[PDB]
């Protein structure tokens, strides 16, 4: 239509004296036209045009004002000294009428940056509360843009934003709730308060419902303090308003992840909610679906089926038919697959071009995804090969072949062989590469390789370089794997085809010379089956889904080992007792992502305990350095050393340790409590993940106590015969004490309490005791730190409560004393 240069240029007159609202407005229209028609502005002339226009803001005409808003936003980024236009926009923005109000806030806020943010706020507060949708919605979207430049200004507007939220007017609410969710967010909980306020309400605003559904879709039970249900009384889990999109979004989330469970007037576990909307017009597309559903997509699938299946079969309209395939695909599942496959077979008949490729891929893809047997997948993959013969590709040769060598290989090659009979050189580089690669790699004894070779030999002549090169190298590997083959390799390679073309020659000269001339140490080594060049995943199935309706390694296996590894890096802990075990009951001192996350584990050594404290400073305003967790033992333990966490910045874990020595004569338990306080140096930080200030202050954060149990000292085992082990460990360290467990009225619980506490597995599966028997003998075994066995015998008497005489024997005085004390 227009020329960008002439129009950008003539705009410069505004900058001088002429303001002429008609002429300038036209010139502006022309700018909008240059963009719209599709053109790109030249920067010098743009920069000039922008400074000129600001003069035009003096004249207040509604069409000129309008031109001015669109033109400055489009020209804003390809212009300089734009800042002048802010004042003019504020002047316009306060002027009453929707033409100015709404369009200005949007143009102003786009140009506005954090410095300028402050200016627009009075006018913004006035514009947001409006139940006149233009002014309010433009102001609400405007605030969203402004969250970037400066967050804090926008946040103050949360009250005006909320005020708009209370409208049932669709725009004012959609914008209000949507924006609010973004704005007020400083934690989940404050947003959740905003949502609960609207939540109990039966809106007539579908957009608000939708934007909110998304916020809601996850279970929120902290909305406005707390509440006893994930409840959403606005359609998400409810079905207060029917309207097929909202109904679909809501129904797929709620069914197997309740936003609330099913109500008689609002299904929300049952499959129903989608289905009542399901017979419909074009509208049906949302309605008919599924996704998730109780307990599977399949009972759901049956409802809707008439609709999806008739459109999919009948309509050879692309627009309908696509909705019908997506809808079939959605009502699908593992079960559904029988049905889904016949339909997809049928579908290509309506739209057959790419759609053909897709159905032959889909039937294979569905068989791989939803199991109807891996074999059937191969058989479908043959049908794909047959029908298209060329829309298979290179990625198919690699994917078919890799997939095939899971089971199919002998068959696949053979099928491929037959498939190769097709068409000599229009079959493509890829099929020849597949029969060639497979015949090379398997080295057929399932069928005679001679047919395969004869088929491939012809294809090579008239097809691309990459296959002819493929054919020589394959032949060489084929030689190395099977001796028999060598005579065919020679007739093929001497030919002008499989060698002596171009690329084919170079590869061949190498491959040939290595087979012919050389040892074939290399050739032998090279064939490991004669496999592909790469093993990807199973690419086809996802591709197909969209297209149709258009080494974790480990050391440790035990808590002691993983901790032992962590400990081992540090010297002191392995140098001063080596680790018998680490706790089977590690206790987290301070909860996750609050102030600190500290998890401590107590590790036992031959004569020591090391406490590993994994410390996180989740303090947004700080970053920590030289952090240690300090300890006060409540019994006689010596605290030898502290190992610091070098730094703990915001949200970054670090580990600190305290090594203490264990008593080895203590008459009371090694079940003991340590009071923990982390001390550290704080340097100020701007929350990101870390950043330290030039100077800072000392600060401390209090932590929970760490409890060490007898369970940490002992590792559980059972014995085949307790009595022998029990005598064998040391009846010379034997001590006996009688306890009453009055809070345990039966033997079975009693055995469980001694077993858990001590960290001893009761022998011979003695946690199950004959219910309410007068006498019982409980056999305990486990190994104590240092590597010495500890056996405990508890002879239980059951009155109405449990009394036990617990006799313990151990290779030391300490386990005996420790167990006896801890139990009572």
């Amino acid at each position: 239509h227009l020329e960008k240069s002439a129009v950008l240029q003539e705009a410069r007159v505004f900058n001088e004296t002429p303001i002429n609202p008609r002429k300038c407005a036209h010139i502006l229209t022309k700018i909008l036209y240059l963009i719209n028609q599709g053109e790109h502005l030249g920067t010098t002339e743009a920069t000039e045009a922008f400074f000129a226009m600001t003069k035009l803001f003096q004249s207040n005409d509604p069409t000129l004002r309008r031109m001015c808003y669109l033109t400055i936003k489009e020209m804003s980024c390809i212009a300089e000294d734009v800042i002048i236009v802010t004042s003019s926009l504020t002047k316009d923005m306060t002027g009453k009428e929707d033409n100015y109000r709404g369009p200005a806030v949007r143009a102003l806020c786009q140009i506005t940056d954090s410095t300028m943010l402050q200016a627009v706020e009075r006018y913004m507060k006035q514009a947001i509360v409006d139940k006149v949708p233009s002014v309010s919605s433009s102001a609400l979207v405007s605030s969203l843009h402004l969250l970037k430049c400066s967050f804090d200004v926008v946040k103050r507007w949360v009250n005006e934003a909320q005020e708009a939220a209370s409208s049932d007017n669709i725009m004012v609410q959609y914008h209000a709730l949507g924006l609010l969710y973004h704005v007020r967010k400083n934690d989940r909980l404050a947003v959740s308060k905003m949502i609960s306020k609207f939540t109990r309400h039966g809106l007539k605003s579908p957009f608000a419902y939708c934007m909110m559904i998304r916020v809601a879709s996850k279970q929120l039970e902290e909305e406005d303090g707390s509440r006893d249900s994930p409840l959403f009384d606005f359609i998400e889990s409810c079905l207060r308003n029917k309207h097929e999109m909202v109904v679909y979004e809501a129904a797929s989330a709620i069914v197997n992840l309740p936003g609330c469970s099913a109500k008689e007037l609002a299904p929300a576990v049952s499959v129903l909610q989608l289905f009542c909307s399901s017979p419909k017009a074009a509208l049906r597309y949302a309605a008919v679906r599924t996704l998730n559903k109780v307990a599977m997509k399949h009972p759901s699938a049956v409802t809707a089926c008439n609709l999806d299946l008739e459109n999919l079969v009948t309509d050879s309209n692309r627009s309908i038919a696509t909705l019908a395939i997506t809808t079939l695909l959605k009502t699908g599942s593992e079960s559904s697959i029988d049905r889904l496959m016949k339909q997809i077979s049928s579908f290509m008949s309506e739209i057959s071009d790419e759609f053909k490729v897709v159905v032959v891929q889909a039937i294979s893809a569905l068989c791989q995804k939803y199991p109807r047997k891996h074999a059937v997948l191969m058989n479908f993959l043959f049908t794909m090969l047959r029908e298209e013969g060329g829309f298979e590709y290179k990625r198919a040769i690699v994917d078919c072949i890799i997939s095939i060598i899971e089971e199919n290989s002998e068959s696949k090659e053979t099928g491929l062989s037959h498939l190769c009979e097709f068409i000599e050189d229009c079959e493509f580089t890829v099929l020849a590469t597949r029969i060639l690669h497979l015949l090379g790699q398997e080295g057929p004894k399932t069928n005679n390789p001679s047919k395969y070779i004869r088929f491939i030999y012809n294809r090579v002549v008239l097809e691309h370089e990459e296959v002819r090169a493929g054919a020589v190298s394959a032949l060489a590997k084929f030689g190395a794997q099977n001796e028999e083959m060598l005579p065919s390799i020679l007739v093929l390679l001497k030919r002008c085809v499989m060698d002596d073309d171009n690329e084919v020659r170079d590869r061949a000269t190498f491959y040939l010379n290595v087979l012919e001339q050389k040892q074939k140490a290399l050739n032998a080594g090279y064939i490991l089956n004669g496999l592909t060049v790469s093993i990807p995943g199973l690419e086809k199935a996802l591709q197909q889904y969209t297209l149709e309706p258009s080494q974790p390694e480990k050391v440790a296996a035990t808590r002691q080992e993983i901790f032992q590894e962590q400990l081992a890096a540090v010297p002191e802990f392995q140098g001063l007792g080596p680790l018998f075990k680490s706790s089977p009951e590690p206790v987290a001192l301070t909860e996750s992502e609050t102030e600190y996350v500290i998890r401590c584990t107590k590790h036992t050594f031959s004569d020591h305990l090391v406490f590993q404290f994994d410390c996180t400073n989740t303090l947004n305003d700080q970053t920590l350095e030289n952090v240690t967790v300090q300890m006060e033992p409540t019994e006689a333990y010596e605290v030898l050393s502290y190992v610091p966490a070098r730094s703990l910045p915001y949200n970054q874990p670090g580990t600190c340790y305290t090594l203490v020595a264990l008593p080895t004569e203590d008459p009371t338990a090694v079940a003991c409590t340590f009071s923990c306080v982390m001390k550290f140096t704080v340097k100020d930080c701007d929350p990101n993940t870390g950043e330290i200030d030039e100077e800072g202050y000392e600060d401390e954060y209090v932590l929970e106590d760490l409890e060490v149990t007898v369970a940490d000292h002992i590792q559980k085992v059972m014995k085949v015969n307790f009595e022998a082990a029990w005598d064998e460990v040391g009846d010379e360290f034997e001590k006996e004490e009688t306890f009453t467990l009055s809070t345990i009225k039966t033997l079975e619980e009693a055995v469980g309490n001694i077993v858990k506490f001590l960290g001893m597995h009761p022998c011979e599966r003695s946690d199950k005791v004959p219910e309410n028997k007068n006498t019982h003998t409980l056999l305990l075994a486990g190994v104590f730190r240092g590597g010495h066995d500890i056996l405990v015998r508890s002879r239980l008497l059951l009155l109405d409560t449990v009394t036990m005489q617990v006799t313990a024997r151990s290779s030391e005085e300490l386990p005996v004393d420790i167990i006896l004390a801890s139990v009572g």
Binding site: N36, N99, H145, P206, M245, L283, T322, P549
Partner: protein, 139 residues
Amino acid sequence: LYTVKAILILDNDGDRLFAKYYDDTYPSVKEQKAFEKNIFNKTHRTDSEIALLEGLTVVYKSSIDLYFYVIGSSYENELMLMAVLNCLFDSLSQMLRKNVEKRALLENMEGLFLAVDEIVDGGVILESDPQQVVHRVAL
């Protein structure tokens, strides 16, 4: 805050009489036109309120020599999108003082540009009331 991906009003080839991009995904002419040609090819010569293109529900209508578009998300349905598309058709008609054809749009290029910006704002649906848009805009 997002519903509408883009709005296009296209001649009966898919070429840009108009498009205004409420996505940031097409700003350059080459690609804005490619998009336009892409959506017009699927959707056209099968009029319904549904089309699925690019994994997005595309809602469209037609006139004498134009096809009118809203592209939006496919987690929705036609009807939500349709309310935008109905506003788009309607508001342009009342605004221009003549029904949407290539002739009405070209007749008043300014009314068309302004009217569409009121309907969609950066992919959020700013307005959907045809009457409101028309008063809001000044020719």
